Symmetry: C2
Subunit: 296 residues, 2 copies
């Protein structure tokens, strides 16, 4: 394989959404030591050219704004090369499935329409080619292998995996806020807001540093979902430092881990910007599903 296909309402225009998302993808790969040659957005998708597609994919699953990810092989769009590459990918996957006669299907999509054959014809010819070289059978309902094919600007992208991303919005597309971090709950609140496209500056309040080591541990976990932001924990010894942080970095909101009025009234007055409580405002079922996927 040589690339990773990245598939993705926002207050950002389409072009800025893509530029910010590509920025975050770039920062994630650099931070996690995954090599890549290029990153570009064309015809609604982002292509990351890299010789470490599997490693890249694993990382990109944590980048908000991404719906699905597909490690893949990019080849010249010719029936000959598409057939050979599709068979090569099928055999690698078949080896992993471990069945003598795996069920499969082919799914092709012409992003751009210059290729002379339509999706149906591509799927039929590729299926016939595979059927002539491996013991297997076509099954459109239940299959062990799915050969996906996307053709765009004279290139064919062939894959067998469609990894689900976290969805949400790209970090930085919905502004910048500070997140008051002190426990697992406040940490979850920060995660839920980053998924909403908010760049968060985590802050630990207080001179007393007994709970600081524990907090740094929490941030180290959250950091893996913060690509695009500086991701530096700010320790504020007193409140004047928090207000200064808000002013100096153009913060537009404050996130707290309050869970389900008095504190809310007091919060409203002590902060010069709106305070958000994700654990209270968002649907319980949604939060539940997020916790479940995070294994909490």
């Amino acid at each position: 394989m040589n690339v990773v296909i990245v598939r993705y309402k926002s207050r950002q225009t389409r072009s800025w959404f893509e530029k910010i998302l590509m920025n975050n993808i770039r920062e994630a790969l650099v931070t996690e030591e995954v090599p890549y040659k290029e990153i570009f957005s064309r015809h609604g998708r982002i292509i990351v050219k890299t010789n470490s597609p599997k490693e890249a994919a694993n990382v990109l699953v944590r980048v908000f704004g991404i719906v699905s990810i597909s490690p893949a092989m990019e080849v010249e769009a010719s029936l000959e090369k598409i057939n050979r590459t599709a068979l090569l990918m099928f055999r690698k996957k078949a080896k992993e499935v471990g069945k003598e006669r795996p069920k499969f299907r082919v799914t092709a999509r012409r992003i751009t329409k210059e290729f002379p054959l339509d999706s149906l014809e591509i799927q039929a010819k590729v299926g016939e080619y595979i059927l002539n070289n491996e013991n297997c059978e076509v099954d459109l309902k239940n299959y062990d292998i799915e050969i996906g094919i996307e053709i765009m600007q004279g290139k064919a992208y062939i894959y067998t995996e469609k990894i689900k991303g976290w969805g949400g919005l790209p970090i930085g597309t919905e502004g910048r806020m500070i997140g008051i971090l002190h426990d697992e709950l406040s940490a979850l609140a920060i995660f839920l807001m980053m998924k909403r496209g908010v760049e968060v500056i985590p802050v630990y309040i207080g001179k007393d540093d007994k709970n600081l080591e524990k907090v740094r541990s929490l941030w180290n976990l959250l950091k893996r979902y913060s690509y695009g932001s500086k991701g530096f924990l700010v320790v504020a010894e007193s409140f004047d430092r928090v207000l200064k942080l808000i002013r100096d970095f153009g913060v537009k909101g404050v996130i707290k881990g309050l869970r389900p009025v008095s504190e809310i009234t007091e919060d409203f007055k002590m902060f010069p910007v709106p305070v958000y409580y994700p654990l209270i405002a968002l649907p319980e079922e949604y939060i539940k599903s997020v916790k479940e996927r995070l294994g909490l």
Copy 2:
């Protein structure tokens, strides 16, 4: 005198901030202004809709504060215990000082009183009548509510009376910082005026020069030096960006919510391509004060600035 009365807030005006934050931000800018100009002062506080600056250099403080946005009017004043006796004698003392400056045998005057808090026994009109009678009995003068050479102002708040004869008009607008932060592309007099107009609307502006260390930069630094005298509350440092990538970096790093340009209708084509292009090159909204704000208003600003 021993204080400066700072008045703010005006009907029909909208501030995204609550009154409390509006006042804290304004006091912050007032402190920055006085400290920058090295004007001594003892205290600065906000009470009952007014900001009081306790200082033995009231005239000097007042002249600096004229350049602080969000201020409607400024009055150097004498603070005294709120007793009719003290109010009368201080009012006469200040009236005489002003009358000497006016230089007329029989100046026209009026008294304007306000009970900010309501503990004083006499209402505003009673105070005006009594103080006016005191002055009329001790000086050759005449009451005239429409045209007057002298106005004796009296504000009573929490047992203290603030007496003044001067009421300096501020620039109005909103305190710098109450309406967010934006970068202002500075390159000429027009863009400088554009920035001035936005700061007046309470926007903290980071001036940015897109270019190299040339002669136009020297010209820009001098433009910024003039604008700086109206930017108390912001960092107020000119940023030189060698390329557009540095501008985007600045926007991201400082959490800028908008970009200000000095574009005029006279610089656009029927397709306003520069506007549509601007919309695409910047990740945040771009504002054009010289196009969006009324013509007569802009002229008034230029007139007051002597441009």
